[PDB]
Short mmCIF file of C-alpha atoms and ligand atoms in Angstrom, two decimals:
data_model
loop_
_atom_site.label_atom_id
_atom_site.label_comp_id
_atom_site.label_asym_id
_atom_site.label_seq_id
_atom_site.Cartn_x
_atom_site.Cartn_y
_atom_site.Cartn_z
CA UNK A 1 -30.51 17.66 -38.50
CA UNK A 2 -30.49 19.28 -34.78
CA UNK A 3 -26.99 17.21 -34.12
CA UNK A 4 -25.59 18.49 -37.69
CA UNK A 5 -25.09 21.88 -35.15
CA UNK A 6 -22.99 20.07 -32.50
CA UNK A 7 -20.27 18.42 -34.80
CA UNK A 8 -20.19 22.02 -36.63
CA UNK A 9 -19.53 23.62 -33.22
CA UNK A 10 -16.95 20.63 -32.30
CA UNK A 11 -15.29 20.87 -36.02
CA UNK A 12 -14.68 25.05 -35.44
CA UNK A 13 -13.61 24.14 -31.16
CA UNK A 14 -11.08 22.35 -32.31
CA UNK A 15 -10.30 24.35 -35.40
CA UNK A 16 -9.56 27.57 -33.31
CA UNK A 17 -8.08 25.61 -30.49
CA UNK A 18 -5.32 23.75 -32.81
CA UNK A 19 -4.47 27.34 -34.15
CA UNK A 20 -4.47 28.83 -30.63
CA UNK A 21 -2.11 26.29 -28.77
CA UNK A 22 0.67 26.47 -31.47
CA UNK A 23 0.91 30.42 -31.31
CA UNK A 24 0.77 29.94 -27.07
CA UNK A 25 1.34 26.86 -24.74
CA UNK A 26 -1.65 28.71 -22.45
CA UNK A 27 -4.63 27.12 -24.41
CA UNK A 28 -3.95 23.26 -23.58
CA UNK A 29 -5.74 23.15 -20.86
CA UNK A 30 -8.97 24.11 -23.27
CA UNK A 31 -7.78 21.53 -25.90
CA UNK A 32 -7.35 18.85 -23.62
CA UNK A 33 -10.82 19.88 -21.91
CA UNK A 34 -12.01 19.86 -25.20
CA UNK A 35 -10.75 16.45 -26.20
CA UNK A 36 -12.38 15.36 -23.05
CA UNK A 37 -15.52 16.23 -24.01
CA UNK A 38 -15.65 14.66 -27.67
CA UNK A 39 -14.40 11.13 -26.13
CA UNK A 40 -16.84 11.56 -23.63
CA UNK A 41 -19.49 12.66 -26.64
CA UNK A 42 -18.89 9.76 -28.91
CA UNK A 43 -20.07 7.20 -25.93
CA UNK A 44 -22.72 8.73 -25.34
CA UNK A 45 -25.90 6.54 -26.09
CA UNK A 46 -28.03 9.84 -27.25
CA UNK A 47 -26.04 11.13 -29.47
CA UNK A 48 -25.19 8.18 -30.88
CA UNK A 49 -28.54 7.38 -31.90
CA UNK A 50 -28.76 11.32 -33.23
CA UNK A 51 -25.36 10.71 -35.21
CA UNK A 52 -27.08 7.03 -36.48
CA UNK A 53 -30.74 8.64 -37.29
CA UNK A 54 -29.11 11.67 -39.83
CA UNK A 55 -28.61 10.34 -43.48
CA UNK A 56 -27.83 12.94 -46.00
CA UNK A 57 -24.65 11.04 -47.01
CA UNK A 58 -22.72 13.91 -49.27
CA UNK A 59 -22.74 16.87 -46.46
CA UNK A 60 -22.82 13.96 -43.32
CA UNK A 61 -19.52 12.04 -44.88
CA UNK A 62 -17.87 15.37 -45.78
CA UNK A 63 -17.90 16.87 -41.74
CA UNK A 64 -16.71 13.46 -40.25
CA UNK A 65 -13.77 13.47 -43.16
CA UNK A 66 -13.18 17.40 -42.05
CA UNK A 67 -13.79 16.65 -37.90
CA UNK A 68 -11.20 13.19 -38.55
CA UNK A 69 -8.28 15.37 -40.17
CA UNK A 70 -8.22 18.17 -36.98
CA UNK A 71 -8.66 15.69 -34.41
CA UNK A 72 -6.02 14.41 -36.17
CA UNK A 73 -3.51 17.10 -35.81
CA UNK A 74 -4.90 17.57 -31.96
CA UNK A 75 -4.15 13.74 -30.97
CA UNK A 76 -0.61 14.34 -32.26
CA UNK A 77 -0.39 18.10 -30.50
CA UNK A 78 -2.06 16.62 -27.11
CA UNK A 79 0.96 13.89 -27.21
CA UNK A 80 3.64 16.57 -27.98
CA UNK A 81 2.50 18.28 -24.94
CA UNK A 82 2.22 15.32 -22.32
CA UNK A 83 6.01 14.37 -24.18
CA UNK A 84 7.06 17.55 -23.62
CA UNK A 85 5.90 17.85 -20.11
CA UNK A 86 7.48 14.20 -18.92
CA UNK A 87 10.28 15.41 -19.95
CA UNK A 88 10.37 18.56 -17.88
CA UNK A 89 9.94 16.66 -15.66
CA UNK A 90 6.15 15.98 -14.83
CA UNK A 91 3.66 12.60 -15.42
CA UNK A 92 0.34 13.54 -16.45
CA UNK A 93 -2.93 11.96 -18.27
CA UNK A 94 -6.69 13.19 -19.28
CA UNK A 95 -9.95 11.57 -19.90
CA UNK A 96 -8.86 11.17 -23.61
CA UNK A 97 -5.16 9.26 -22.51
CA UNK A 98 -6.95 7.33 -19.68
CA UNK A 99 -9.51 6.43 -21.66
CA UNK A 100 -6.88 4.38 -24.29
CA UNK A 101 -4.20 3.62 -22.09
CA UNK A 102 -6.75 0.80 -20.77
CA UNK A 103 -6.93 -2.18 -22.64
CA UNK A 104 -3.87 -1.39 -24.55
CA UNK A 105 -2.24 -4.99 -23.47
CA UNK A 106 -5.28 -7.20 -24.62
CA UNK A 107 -5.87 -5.59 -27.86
CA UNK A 108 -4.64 -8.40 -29.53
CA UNK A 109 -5.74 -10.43 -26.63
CA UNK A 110 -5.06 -11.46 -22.93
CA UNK A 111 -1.42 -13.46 -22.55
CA UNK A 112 -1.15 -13.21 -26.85
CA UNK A 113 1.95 -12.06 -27.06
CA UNK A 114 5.48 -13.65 -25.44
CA UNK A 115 8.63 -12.46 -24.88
CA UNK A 116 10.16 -13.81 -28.29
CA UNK A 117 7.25 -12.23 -30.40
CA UNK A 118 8.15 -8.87 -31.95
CA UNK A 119 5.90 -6.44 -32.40
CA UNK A 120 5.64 -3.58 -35.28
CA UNK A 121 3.19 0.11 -34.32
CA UNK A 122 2.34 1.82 -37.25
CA UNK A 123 2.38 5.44 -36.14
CA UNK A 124 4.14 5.58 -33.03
CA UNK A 125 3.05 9.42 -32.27
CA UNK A 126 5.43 11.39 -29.95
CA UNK A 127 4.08 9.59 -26.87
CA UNK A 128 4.42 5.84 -27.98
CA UNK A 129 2.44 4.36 -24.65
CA UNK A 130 2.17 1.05 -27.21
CA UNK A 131 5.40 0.36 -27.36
CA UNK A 132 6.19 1.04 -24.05
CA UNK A 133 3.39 -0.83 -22.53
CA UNK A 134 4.21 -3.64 -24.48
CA UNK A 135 7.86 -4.28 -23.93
CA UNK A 136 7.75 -3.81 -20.20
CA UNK A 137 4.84 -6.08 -19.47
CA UNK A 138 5.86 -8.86 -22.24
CA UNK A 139 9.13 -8.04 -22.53
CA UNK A 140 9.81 -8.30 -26.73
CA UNK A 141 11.20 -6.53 -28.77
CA UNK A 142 8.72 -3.83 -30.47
CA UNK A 143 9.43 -1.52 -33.68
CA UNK A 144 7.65 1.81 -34.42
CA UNK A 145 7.59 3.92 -37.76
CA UNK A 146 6.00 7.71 -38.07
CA UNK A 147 5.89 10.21 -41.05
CA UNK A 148 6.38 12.69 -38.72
CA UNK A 149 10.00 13.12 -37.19
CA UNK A 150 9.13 15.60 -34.30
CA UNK A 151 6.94 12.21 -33.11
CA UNK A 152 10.08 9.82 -34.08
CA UNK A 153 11.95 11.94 -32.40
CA UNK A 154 10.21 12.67 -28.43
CA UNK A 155 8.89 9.06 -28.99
CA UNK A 156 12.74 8.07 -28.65
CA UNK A 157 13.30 10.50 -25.88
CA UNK A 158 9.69 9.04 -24.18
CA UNK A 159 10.62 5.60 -24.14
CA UNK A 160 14.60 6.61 -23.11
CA UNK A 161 12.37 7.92 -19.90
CA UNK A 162 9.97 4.77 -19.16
CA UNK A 163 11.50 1.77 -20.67
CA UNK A 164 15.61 2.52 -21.39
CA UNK A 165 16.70 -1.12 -20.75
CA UNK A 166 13.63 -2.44 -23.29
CA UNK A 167 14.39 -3.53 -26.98
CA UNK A 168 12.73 -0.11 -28.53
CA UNK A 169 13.16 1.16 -31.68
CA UNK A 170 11.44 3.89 -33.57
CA UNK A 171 12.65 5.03 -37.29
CA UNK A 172 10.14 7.13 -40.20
CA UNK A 173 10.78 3.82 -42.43
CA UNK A 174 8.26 2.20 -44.50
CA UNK A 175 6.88 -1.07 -44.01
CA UNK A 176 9.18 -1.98 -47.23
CA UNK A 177 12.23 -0.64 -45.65
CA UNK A 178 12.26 -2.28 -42.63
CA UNK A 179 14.79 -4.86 -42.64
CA UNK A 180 13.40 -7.33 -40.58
CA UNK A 181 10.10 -7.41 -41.73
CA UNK A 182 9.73 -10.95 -41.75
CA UNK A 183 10.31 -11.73 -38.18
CA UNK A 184 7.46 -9.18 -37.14
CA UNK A 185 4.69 -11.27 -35.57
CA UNK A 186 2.08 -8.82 -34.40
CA UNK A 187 1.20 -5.39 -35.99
CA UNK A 188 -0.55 -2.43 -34.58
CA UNK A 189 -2.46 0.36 -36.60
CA UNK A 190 -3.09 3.19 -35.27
CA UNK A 191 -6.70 4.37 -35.89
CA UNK A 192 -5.93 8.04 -37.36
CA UNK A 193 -4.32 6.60 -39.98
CA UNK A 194 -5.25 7.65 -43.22
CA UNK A 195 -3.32 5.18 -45.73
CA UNK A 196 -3.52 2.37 -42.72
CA UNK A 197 -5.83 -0.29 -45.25
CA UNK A 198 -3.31 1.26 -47.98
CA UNK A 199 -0.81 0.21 -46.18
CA UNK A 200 -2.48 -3.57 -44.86
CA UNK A 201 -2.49 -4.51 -48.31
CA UNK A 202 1.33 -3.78 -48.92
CA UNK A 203 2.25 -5.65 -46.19
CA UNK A 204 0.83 -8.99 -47.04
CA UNK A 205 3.40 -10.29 -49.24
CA UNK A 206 6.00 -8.30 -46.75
CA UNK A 207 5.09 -10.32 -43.84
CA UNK A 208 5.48 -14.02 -42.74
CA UNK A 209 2.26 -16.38 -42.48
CA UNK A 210 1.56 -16.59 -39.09
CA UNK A 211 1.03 -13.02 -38.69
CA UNK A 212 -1.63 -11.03 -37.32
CA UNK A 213 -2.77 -7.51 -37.32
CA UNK A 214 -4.59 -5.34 -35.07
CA UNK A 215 -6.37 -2.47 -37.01
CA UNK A 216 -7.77 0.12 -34.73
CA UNK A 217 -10.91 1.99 -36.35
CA UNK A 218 -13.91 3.24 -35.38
CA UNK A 219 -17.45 3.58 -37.26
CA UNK A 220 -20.86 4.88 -36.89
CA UNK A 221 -20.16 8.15 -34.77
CA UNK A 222 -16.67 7.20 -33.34
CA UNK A 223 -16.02 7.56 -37.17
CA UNK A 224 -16.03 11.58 -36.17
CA UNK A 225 -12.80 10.74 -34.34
CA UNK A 226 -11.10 7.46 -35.90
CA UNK A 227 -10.42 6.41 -39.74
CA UNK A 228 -13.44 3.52 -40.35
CA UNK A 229 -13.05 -0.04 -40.72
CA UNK A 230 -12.81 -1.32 -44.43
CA UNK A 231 -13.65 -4.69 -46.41
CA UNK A 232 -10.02 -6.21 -48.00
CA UNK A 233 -9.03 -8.00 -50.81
CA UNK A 234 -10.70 -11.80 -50.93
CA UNK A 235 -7.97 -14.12 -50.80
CA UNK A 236 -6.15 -12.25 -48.52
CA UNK A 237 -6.33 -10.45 -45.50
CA UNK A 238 -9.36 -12.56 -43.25
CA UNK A 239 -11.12 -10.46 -40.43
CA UNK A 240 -11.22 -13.27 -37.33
CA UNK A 241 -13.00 -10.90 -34.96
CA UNK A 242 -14.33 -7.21 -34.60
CA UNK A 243 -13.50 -6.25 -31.22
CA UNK A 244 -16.00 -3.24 -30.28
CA UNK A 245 -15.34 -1.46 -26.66
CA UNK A 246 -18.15 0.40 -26.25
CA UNK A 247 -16.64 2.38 -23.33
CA UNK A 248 -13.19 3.37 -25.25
CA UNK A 249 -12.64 5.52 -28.23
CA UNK A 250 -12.03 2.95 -30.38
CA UNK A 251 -12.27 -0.23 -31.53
CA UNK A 252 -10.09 -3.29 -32.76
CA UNK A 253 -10.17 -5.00 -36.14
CA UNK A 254 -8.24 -8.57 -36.25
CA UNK A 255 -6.97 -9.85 -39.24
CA UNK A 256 -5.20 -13.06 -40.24
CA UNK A 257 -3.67 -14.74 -43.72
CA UNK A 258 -6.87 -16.32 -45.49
CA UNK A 259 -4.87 -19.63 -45.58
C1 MTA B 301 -0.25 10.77 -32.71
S1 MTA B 301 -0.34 9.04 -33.03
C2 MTA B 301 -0.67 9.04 -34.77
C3 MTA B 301 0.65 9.08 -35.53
O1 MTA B 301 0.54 8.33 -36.75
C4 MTA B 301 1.38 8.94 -37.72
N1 MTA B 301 0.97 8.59 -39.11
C5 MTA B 301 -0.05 9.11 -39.82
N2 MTA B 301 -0.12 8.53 -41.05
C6 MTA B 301 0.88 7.63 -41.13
C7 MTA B 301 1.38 6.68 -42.15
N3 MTA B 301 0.79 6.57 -43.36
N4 MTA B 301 2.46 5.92 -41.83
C8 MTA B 301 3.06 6.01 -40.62
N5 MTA B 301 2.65 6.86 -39.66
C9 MTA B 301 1.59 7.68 -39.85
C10 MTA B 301 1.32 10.43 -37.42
O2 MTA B 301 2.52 11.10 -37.82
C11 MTA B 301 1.10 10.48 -35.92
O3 MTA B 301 2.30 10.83 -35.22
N1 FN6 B 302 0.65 6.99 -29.30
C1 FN6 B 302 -0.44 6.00 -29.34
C2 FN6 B 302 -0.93 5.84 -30.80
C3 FN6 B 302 -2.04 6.83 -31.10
N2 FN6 B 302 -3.27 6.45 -30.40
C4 FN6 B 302 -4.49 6.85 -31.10
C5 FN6 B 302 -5.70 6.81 -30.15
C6 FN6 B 302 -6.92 7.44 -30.74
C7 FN6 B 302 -7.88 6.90 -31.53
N3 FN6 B 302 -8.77 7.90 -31.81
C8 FN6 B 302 -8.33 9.00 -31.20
N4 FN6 B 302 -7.21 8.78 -30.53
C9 FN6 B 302 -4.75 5.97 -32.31
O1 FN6 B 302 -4.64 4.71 -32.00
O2 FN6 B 302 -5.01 6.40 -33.41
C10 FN6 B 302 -0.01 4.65 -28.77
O3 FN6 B 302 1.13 4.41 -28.43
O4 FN6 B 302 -1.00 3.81 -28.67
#
């Protein structure tokens, strides 16, 4: 009940600060301050229990659905800016980027993937540090697909900047358009992903059998700022291990074939 106030007072922050960095590039420094804050918020043990304690499921599920959709918009905006800004010539992070930029390599796991493995990101975003990450320190060959083309297109400019001479390629294809679907041996999700378990189930029969996939979720109050984890069809995809961080924003789901 006395949290219910905070999330309201997050949910109209980054309302008016979305709205207020598109008109004018002078209110990013508040957003990313902002952003700062809420990843700094959500691992926070008090709160936490405060978030955990409040019930009333209708009005509770209805402001983390509304707080996930403009965090959203401000994850995409806040990697628009920091693309934008490499490319005029200037590196940069925050708490929010240095918070996820982390573990990034041993989401899957430590030494999982090789240089012949090939890697597919499910929304790249216009800063793709995934891909990049991943194809410099393994050295494979790693695919990434967006809706949005203003992220397909600085991601290709971001990585022509890091990681030029590294097999990178970023398109706004489908999982059922991609040609080589069935040489993919590890796929990312990332966690603000709204169709992302929509899109898991597709690409079962898309996919070889020794595939696995790394869905990035968060629940309980990291739910205010990630898409939740989900149960999947029996028979199908199997969950090996739930991988919480409970120092990073998110968290990692693993899934294998059941057989
Ligand atoms: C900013 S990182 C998150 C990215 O995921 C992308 N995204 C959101 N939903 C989907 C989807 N269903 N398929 C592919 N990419 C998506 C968004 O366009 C954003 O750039
Ligand atoms: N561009 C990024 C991909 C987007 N990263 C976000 C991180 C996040 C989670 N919650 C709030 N922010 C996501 O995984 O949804 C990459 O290359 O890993």
């Amino acid at each position: 009940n006395e949290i219910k106030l905070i999330l309201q007072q997050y949910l109209e922050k980054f309302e008016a600060h979305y709205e207020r960095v598109l008109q004018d590039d002078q209110y990013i420094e508040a957003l990313e301050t902002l952003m700062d804050d809420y990843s700094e918020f959500i691992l926070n043990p008090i709160y936490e229990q405060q978030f955990n304690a409040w019930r009333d499921v209708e009005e509770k599920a209805q402001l983390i659905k509304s707080l996930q959709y403009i965090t959203a918009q401000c994850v995409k905006q806040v990697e628009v800016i920091r693309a934008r800004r490499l490319l005029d010539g200037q590196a940069s992070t925050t708490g929010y980027f240095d918070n996820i930029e982390h573990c990034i390599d041993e989401e899957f796991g430590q030494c999982s993937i090789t240089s012949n493995d090939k890697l597919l990101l499910v929304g790249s975003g216009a800063y793709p540090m995934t891909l990049i990450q991943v194809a410099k320190e393994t050295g494979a060959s790693v695919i990434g697909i967006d809706i949005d083309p203003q992220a397909v297109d600085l991601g290709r400019r971001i990585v022509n900047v890091l990681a030029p001479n590294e097999d990178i390629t970023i398109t706004d294809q489908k999982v059922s358009e991609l040609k080589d679907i069935k040489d993919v041996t590890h796929i990312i999700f990332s966690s603000t992903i709204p169709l992302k378990y929509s899109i898991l189930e597709e690409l079962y029969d898309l996919t070889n059998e020794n595939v696995v996939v790394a869905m990035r979720f968060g629940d309980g109050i990291k739910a205010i700022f990630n898409y939740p984890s989900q149960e999947t069809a029996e028979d199908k995809w199997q969950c090996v291990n739930k991988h919480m961080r409970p120092q990073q924003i998110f968290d990692i789901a693993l899934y294998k074939k059941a057989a």
